[PDB]
Amino acid sequence: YTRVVWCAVGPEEQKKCQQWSQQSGQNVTCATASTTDDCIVLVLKGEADALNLDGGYIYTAGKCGLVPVLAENRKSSKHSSLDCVLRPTEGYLAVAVVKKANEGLTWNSLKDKKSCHTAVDRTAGWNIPMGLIVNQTGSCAFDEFFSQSCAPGADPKSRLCALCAGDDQGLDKCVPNSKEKYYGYTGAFRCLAEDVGDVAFVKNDTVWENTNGESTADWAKNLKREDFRLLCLDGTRKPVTEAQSCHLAVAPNHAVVSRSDRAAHVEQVLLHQQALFGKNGKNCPDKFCLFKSETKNLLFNDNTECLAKLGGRPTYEEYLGTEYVTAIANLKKCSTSPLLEACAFLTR
Amino acid sequence: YTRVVWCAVGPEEQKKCQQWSQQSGQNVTCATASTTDDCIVLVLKGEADALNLDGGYIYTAGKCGLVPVLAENRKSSKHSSLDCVLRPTEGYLAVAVVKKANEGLTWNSLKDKKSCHTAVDRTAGWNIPMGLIVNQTGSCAFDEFFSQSCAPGADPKSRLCALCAGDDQGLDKCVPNSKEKYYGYTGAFRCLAEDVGDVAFVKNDTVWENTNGESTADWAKNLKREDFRLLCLDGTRKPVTEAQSCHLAVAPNHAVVSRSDRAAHVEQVLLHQQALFGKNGKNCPDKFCLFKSETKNLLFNDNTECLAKLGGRPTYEEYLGTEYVTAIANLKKCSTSPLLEACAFLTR
Ligand SMILES: *[C@@H]1O[C@H](CO)[C@@H](O[C@@H]2O[C@H](CO)[C@@H](O)[C@H](O[C@@H]3O[C@H](CO)[C@@H](O)[C@H](O)[C@@H]3O)[C@H]2NC(C)=O)[C@H](O)[C@H]1NC(C)=O
Ligand SMILES: *[C@@H]1O[C@H](CO)[C@@H](O[C@@H]2O[C@H](CO)[C@@H](O[C@@H]3O[C@H](CO)[C@@H](O)[C@H](O)[C@@H]3O)[C@H](O)[C@H]2NC(C)=O)[C@H](O)[C@H]1NC(C)=O
Ligand SMILES: *[C@@H]1O[C@H](CO)[C@@H](O[C@@H]2O[C@H](CO)[C@@H](O[C@@H]3O[C@H](CO)[C@@H](O)[C@H](O)[C@@H]3O)[C@H](O)[C@H]2NC(C)=O)[C@H](O)[C@H]1NC(C)=O
Ligand SMILES: *[C@@H]1O[C@H](CO)[C@@H](O[C@@H]2O[C@H](CO)[C@@H](O[C@@H]3O[C@H](CO)[C@@H](O)[C@H](O)[C@@H]3O)[C@H](O)[C@H]2NC(C)=O)[C@H](O)[C@H]1NC(C)=O
Ligand SMILES: *[C@@H]1O[C@H](CO)[C@@H](O[C@@H]2O[C@H](CO)[C@@H](O)[C@H](O)[C@H]2NC(C)=O)[C@H](O)[C@H]1NC(C)=O
Ligand SMILES: [Fe+3]
Ligand SMILES: [Fe+3]
Numbered sequence: 199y200t201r202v203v204w205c206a207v208g209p210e211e212q213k214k215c216q217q218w219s220q221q222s223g224q225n226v227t228c229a230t231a232s233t234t235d236d237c238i239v240l241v242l243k244g245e246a247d248a249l250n251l252d253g254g255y256i257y258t259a260g261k262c263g264l265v266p267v268l269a270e271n272r273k274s275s276k277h278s279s280l281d282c283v284l285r286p287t288e289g290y291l292a293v294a295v296v297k298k299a300n301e302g303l304t305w306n307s308l309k310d311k312k313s314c315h316t317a318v319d320r321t322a323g324w325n326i327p328m329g330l331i332v333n334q335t336g337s338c339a340f341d342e343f344f345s346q347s348c349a350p351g352a353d354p355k356s357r358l359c360a361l362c363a364g365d366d367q368g369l370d371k372c373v374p375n376s377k378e379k380y381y382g383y384t385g386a387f388r389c390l391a392e393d394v395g396d397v398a399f400v401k402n403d404t405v406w407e408n409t410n411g412e413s414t415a416d417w418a419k420n421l422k423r424e425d426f427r428l429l430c431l432d433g434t435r436k437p438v439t440e441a442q443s444c445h446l447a448v449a450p451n452h453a454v455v456s457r458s459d460r461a462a463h464v465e466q467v468l469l470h471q472q473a474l475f476g477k478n479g480k481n482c483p484d485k486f487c488l489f490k491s492e493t494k495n496l497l498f499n500d501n502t503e504c505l506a507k508l509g510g511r512p513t514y515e516e517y518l519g520t521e522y523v524t525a526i527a528n529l530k531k532c533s534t535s536p537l538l539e540a541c542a543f544l545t546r
Numbered sequence: 547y548t549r550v551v552w553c554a555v556g557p558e559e560q561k562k563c564q565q566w567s568q569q570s571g572q573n574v575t576c577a578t579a580s581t582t583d584d585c586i587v588l589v590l591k592g593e594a595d596a597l598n599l600d601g602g603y604i605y606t607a608g609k610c611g612l613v614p615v616l617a618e619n620r621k622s623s624k625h626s627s628l629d630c631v632l633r634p635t636e637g638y639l640a641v642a643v644v645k646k647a648n649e650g651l652t653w654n655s656l657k658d659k660k661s662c663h664t665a666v667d668r669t670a671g672w673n674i675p676m677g678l679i680v681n682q683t684g685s686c687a688f689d690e691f692f693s694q695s696c697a698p699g700a701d702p703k704s705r706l707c708a709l710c711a712g713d714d715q716g717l718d719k720c721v722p723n724s725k726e727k728y729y730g731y732t733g734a735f736r737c738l739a740e741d742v743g744d745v746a747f748v749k750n751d752t753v754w755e756n757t758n759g760e761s762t763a764d765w766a767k768n769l770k771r772e773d774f775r776l777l778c779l780d781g782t783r784k785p786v787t788e789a790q791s792c793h794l795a796v797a798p799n800h801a802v803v804s805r806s807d808r809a810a811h812v813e814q815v816l817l818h819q820q821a822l823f824g825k826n827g828k829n830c831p832d833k834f835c836l837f838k839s840e841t842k843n844l845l846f847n848d849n850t851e852c853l854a855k856l857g858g859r860p861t862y863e864e865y866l867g868t869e870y871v872t873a874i875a876n877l878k879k880c881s882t883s884p885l886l887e888a889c890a891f892l893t894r
Contacts, residue, residue, distance in 0.1 A: 332572060333567070333568055333572065334568075335564070335576075336563060336564035336565075336566070336567030336568060336572075336575055336576040337567075337575055337576055337577075338549045338551065338572065338575045524571070527571075528571045528572045529572070531548045531549040531571075531572045531573065531575075532547075532549055532572060532575070533547075534547055
């Protein structure tokens with residue numbers, strides 16, 4: 199019980215994990231599953247200790263009795279005195295990104311359109327958009343709102359998994375891991391960019407990092423921030439710059455979860471692991487870099503400066519926030535989750 | 547699937563249902579159909595969960611296996627000090643309303659006159675009046691009794707839809723939906739008010755709520771109780787006050803139907819929904835009033851205090867009463883409906 203078994207989602211995450219493991223000196227070891235829901239199950243089973251999760255998956259984890267340990271933190275514009283770990287979190291902005299070339303496409307026209315999602319149950323990609331749509335229509339029929347979509351983790355045979363491409367060989371299409379071409383923050387934007395979907399739900403940070411040659415990726419190099427507009431709730435269209443007025447909602451930062459018992463242990467091991475392999479670590483870029491994965495945003499986001507502590511001990515509720523928790527719960531009235539079902543009585 | 551999908555009949559009823567959704571936090575969602583029979587079918591397919599139905603519709607939905615869940619209960623004279631939900635259902639009064647200014651018009655001179663009906667297969671508008679007329683004439687030719695009628699839900703290329711006026715632009719003529727100017731209880735009255743029809747088949751409560759400026763509607767604000775008289779099986783006429791002695795029948799109250807598998811859940815959800823959004827509901831009118839539309843009796847009748855419980859788990863037979871079932875049955879031998887033919891095997 200001295201080690202920390204880290205759970206990896208996909209093979210790409212696996213290799214990056216194993217590396218971390220070798221260099222750590224087995225202070226950190228690697229478990230793997232196809233999906234994040236599988237990975238969380240391991241943590242519950244006790245075949246793994248922790249992982250870093252979108253807010254949405256934090257909700258699923260949190261309903262299964264796991265707790266948040268450290269939060270992802272990124273380049274701030276204020277309170278620059280406080281150390282990265284001591285600096286408070288801000289929380290990314292969930293947006294709706296459309297091609298400027300596409301005309302007449304406002305928030306009120308998305309009905310019967312094509313969509314790109316980070317994945318199912320994720321905060322930007324799914325919970326915030328589908329929450330709002332589902333609420334405005336007063337319909338739990340989100341499975342018929344977009345004419346066609348890519349939402350890794352949906353029913354592979356449904357129209358939410360239609361526009362999904364798979365890996366290089368087009369196998370395991372719609373899996374919610376990096377192996378899916380359009381998976382995660384990057385994937386959703388690549389979908390919109392290669393004009394597979396008319397809209398993509400990501401965070402602004404995804405926009406700025408993949409346009410104006412901020413990416414050497416063969417899909418993101420030639421990209422130009424004027425060929426992309428932001429759908430706002432008013433109905434107006436605004437440029438990427440006005441994201442403070444054209445954002446769908448404020449997203450709780452990705453966080454590490456673990457069992458209540460092993461939280462403090464992992465807290466410690468990780469603060470030391472980031473001091474070594476972090477953005478400013480003795481062995482970055484010497485041995486191993488924990489916050490860099492070649493635009494695959496594996497294990498952590500690439501935009502992660504460090505991991506930070508949380509004031510007091512926070513419930514999955516307090517972390518995400520009373521309002522967002524209410525938004526997910528309401529959207530989850532429209533679907534049936536095997537995991538959430540099991541945990542509901544198993545951890546009661 | 548904790549959400550309860552309400553079935554809304556027409557776009558007005560759906561606009562309230564969307565509202566219901568947004569305030570109930572998707573504990574309730576919307577499904578829409580032009581007609582009530584169409585909405586009964588959705589409930590059979592599980593595309594919706596439940597809706598509030600006139601007694602005659604409850605025969606239709608009964609025949610097709612749906613059960614009753616909660617009955618509308620109104621302000622009572624007798625036993626005023628029992629909790630609305632536990633106070634027994636006191637029935638309501640099926641009455642024939644004519645303008646006083648029409649002379650020699652009696653129950654026994656109705657032949658070849660003009661009629662307004664709430665809609666086809668409803669209890670006050672159709673099941674009782676036409677049930678008796680056939681029984682008196684000895685003929686099954688109710689399609690030829692009145693010269694012309696409005697009877698939304700009939701053949702829109704027949705005499706029974708000849709007086710049905712439509713929406714604002716006069717489209718959707720005779721559709722059994724609030725967009726038809728003369729649909730429902732209100733509509734039957736407005737049809738007799740504007741002297742488009744010689745008689746109107748409504749419930750007692752319809753005259754009071756639309757005469758003596760008890761309604762602010764342009765058509766109803768100036769209506770006077772003294773200008774209307776109630777026809778009797780006596781062959782006699784009387785004013786609105788003698789309704790207990792000039793009424794065609796005792797109608798079972800409107801009620802919520804659902805599929806047997808989803809009743810208990812629908813009952814629960816609703817008991818709570820009246821609690822928050824009912825007559826004395828904390829969120830009335832601070833957020834949403836469930837038994838208020840605009841004299842438009844949308845989703846529920848506006849004269850509803852609370853949806854009340856029933857005695858055990860009743861059937862359409864028990865809740866309508868063996869008398870009313872046999873009267874319906876004998877009228878239905880005269881003319882078939884699609885849904886009754888389609889479902890006959892279930893009840894046989
Ligand atoms: C006129 O319509 C009325 C209703 O509008 C019909 O009444 C029912 O008709 C049947 C005959 O098919 C009668 O038997 C029903 O009454 C009796 O109810 C007792 C209960 O005390 C039963 O035990 C009897 O077996 C019997 O069914 C009668 N319903 C009522 C409430 O009286 C009637 O048939 C119809 N008549 C004509 C000529 O059209
Ligand atoms: C939506 O996401 C984008 C992308 O992350 C945000 O832009 C980023 O803003 C930060 C500062 O707040 C920039 O960092 C800067 O670095 C220099 C030194 O290198 C420092 O001295 C400055 O004070 C500044 O902090 C960062 O470069 C920038 N990233 C890119 C690639 O442009 C954007 O703010 C987000 N939008 C909203 C409305 O929040
Ligand atoms: C929509 O969703 C549910 C429908 O069940 C509602 O939440 C439930 O509401 C009750 C409040 O009446 C919650 O707490 C209760 O407290 C009383 C004590 O005062 C206690 O006797 C009850 O057993 C219960 O603990 C209840 O926990 C809650 N259920 C859940 C799972 O959250 C909600 O109010 C509905 N909202 C709307 C706007 O319709
Ligand atoms: C025929 O229809 C009218 C309208 O539905 C009924 O008149 C209603 O009479 C009831 C008594 O049963 C009245 O309720 C009372 O309300 C007062 C306060 O307004 C309260 O102090 C009393 O204790 C009582 O509960 C009700 O106001 C009245 N409604 C209207 C709009 O006039 C009548 O009951 C029906 N007639 C028959 C023969 O069933
Ligand atoms: C769903 O959308 C509706 C509005 O379209 C939101 O409900 C309104 O919110 C305000 C502020 O909380 C309430 O006071 C109003 O009464 C509501 N207006 C209407 C017209 O119902 C609702 O908050 C939205 N749901 C979510 C999860 O954001
Ligand atoms: Fe996220
Ligand atoms: Fe009725």
